[PDB]
Design a protein around this ligand. Structure first.
Ligand SMILES: [Zn+2]
Length: 482
């Protein structure tokens, strides 16, 4: 009879060699079933040591009815109680559970089947071929446990501390959210969080749940970009030479859509007035961006989107990434305002923001660094399949400069005062939950303003109870990682 001291799977580590699985030490008390069932001394000895009761014990007994030896999960058995129990034929072993109670990085890590130990989602499934039976710790019963030179573990790009801070923040939001933080200069993913959460230790209780408790909204959920798309129209316009830094537009609060008497109102309604490019972008002025879009056309804007990696998978090492194809036909109006049949995951928006933030040096977003041994020595390097590109660096630097204005005297002025500044673009997605008009809140940008280290993307889903801005959560993130 085999006693499992761990899941047998390769540990998952963060970028700094801190464990993200296999963190909480616990105990497995092992007793012969006949001895337990026929001898009140042994029952009452186990009860004392575990602090369990008869119901807890005989639940365990009933689950292992057929086995000649019974294994009880417990903890905090000191040394006297340990030798004591061994005098009574009861051996106690130090064990490691796969997932803490903390449950950091749930959707990204995923979960395993308990019989099989096989990966069912996230990293556990995408990297099951290298992690399964790569770290086997077990004893044989009716009475090896320690390291082996061929043990393999997976080291990721995640920063445990940044991940913790982000989960603290999204845990205070009742609305479903998606948040990703990546390194501007390398594309390494420092943190990813989706809400609502699931319990990796209780796949049953969550599966009955109704709100996508198992959806990685960062990599799977697509949303309309709203004004976030003005990064692309602004990029497209400056790259195609249709506008320059000297563009002025007079927002009177409305405009005719091309040649028709179809009318697009501004959000100000009484108008922004005379705007330079910085103000048109900062004010998120729909009429100014229709004016800019009309000068480009559908195809130049889509090619610009394609060039910024919005019409392909980011391919970060997780296979369940979903995307939505470029629309067959869409009105230049819906392009300008970023609504209808154009949608992106937060992962894609983050990748696009990485390029702008990094002055056109595209670093493909990725989650894995290496497969390591028990000494944390590199056995092999992992990296993106994607080729590095230098993309319109000058244009990228212009969009990036204008994004520093949005934070200071724009739609996201509440960020004017954060230590070190930031560059952002906010936006609102228009969806439907039931047939009610529901609004999802976007913000994307980089922190700090001057030499960005972080590319940050947040999406707060609307609910029947109402819609929310992403700006507050972006602010808390920046305040918690200064
Ligand atoms: Zn306007």
């Amino acid at each position: 009879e085999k006693v499992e001291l761990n899941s047998g799977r390769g540990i998952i580590y963060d970028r700094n060699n801190k464990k993200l699985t296999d963190t909480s030490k616990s105990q497995v008390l092992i007793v012969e079933k006949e001895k337990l069932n026929n001898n009140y001394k042994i029952l009452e000895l186990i009860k004392k040591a575990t602090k369990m009761n008869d119901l807890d014990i005989y639940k365990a007994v009933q689950e292992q009815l057929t086995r000649p030896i019974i294994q009880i999960q417990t903890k905090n058995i000191d040394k006297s109680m340990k030798k004591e129990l061994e005098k009574n034929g009861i051996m106690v072993e130090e064990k490691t559970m796969r997932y803490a109670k903390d449950g950091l990085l749930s959707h990204t890590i995923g979960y395993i089947k308990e019989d099989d130990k096989s990966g069912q989602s996230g990293i556990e499934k995408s990297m099951d071929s290298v992690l399964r039976n790569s770290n086997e710790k077990y004893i044989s019963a009716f009475k090896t446990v320690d390291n082996k030179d061929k043990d393999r573990h997976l080291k990721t790009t995640i920063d445990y501390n940044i991940q913790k801070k982000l989960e603290q923040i999204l845990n205070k939001e009742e609305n479903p959210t998606a948040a990703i933080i990546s390194e501007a200069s390398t594309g390494e993913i420092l943190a990813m969080c989706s809400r609502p959460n699931f319990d990796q230790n209780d796949i049953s209780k969550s599966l009955k749940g109704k709100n996508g408790e198992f959806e990685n909204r960062v990599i799977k959920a697509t949303y309309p970009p709203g004004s976030v798309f003005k990064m692309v129209v602004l990029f497209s316009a400056l790259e195609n030479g249709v506008i320059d830094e000297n563009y002025t537009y007079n927002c009177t609060g409305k405009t005719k859509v091309g040649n028709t008497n179809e009318i697009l109102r501004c959000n100000k309604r009484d108008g922004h007035g005379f705007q330079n490019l910085r103000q048109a972008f900062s004010n998120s002025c729909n009429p100014a961006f229709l004016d800019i879009a009309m000068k480009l056309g559908k195809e130049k804007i889509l090619k610009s989107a394609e060039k910024l990696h919005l019409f392909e998978k980011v391919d970060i090492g997780l296979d369940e990434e979903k995307i939505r194809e470029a629309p067959k036909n869409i009105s230049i109006r819906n392009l300008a305002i970023g609504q209808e049949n154009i949608e992106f995951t937060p992962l894609q928006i983050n990748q696009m923001t990485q390029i702008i933030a990094n002055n056109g040096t595209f670093k493909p977003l990725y989650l894995y660094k290496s497969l390591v041994d028990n000494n944390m020595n590199t056995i092999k390097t992992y990296k993106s399949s994607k080729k590095e590109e230098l993309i319109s660096p000058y244009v990228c630097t212009q969009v990036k400069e204008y994004m520093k204005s949005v934070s200071r005297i724009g739609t996201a002025k509440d960020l004017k005062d954060i230590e070190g500044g930031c560059g952002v673009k906010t936006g609102t997605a228009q969806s439907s939950l039931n047939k009610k008009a529901i609004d999802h809140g976007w913000i994307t940008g980089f922190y700090p303003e001057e030499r960005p280290k972080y590319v940050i993307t947040v999406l707060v889903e609307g609910t029947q109870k109402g819609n929310k801005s992403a700006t507050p959560i972006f602010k808390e993130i920046c305040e918690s990682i200064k």
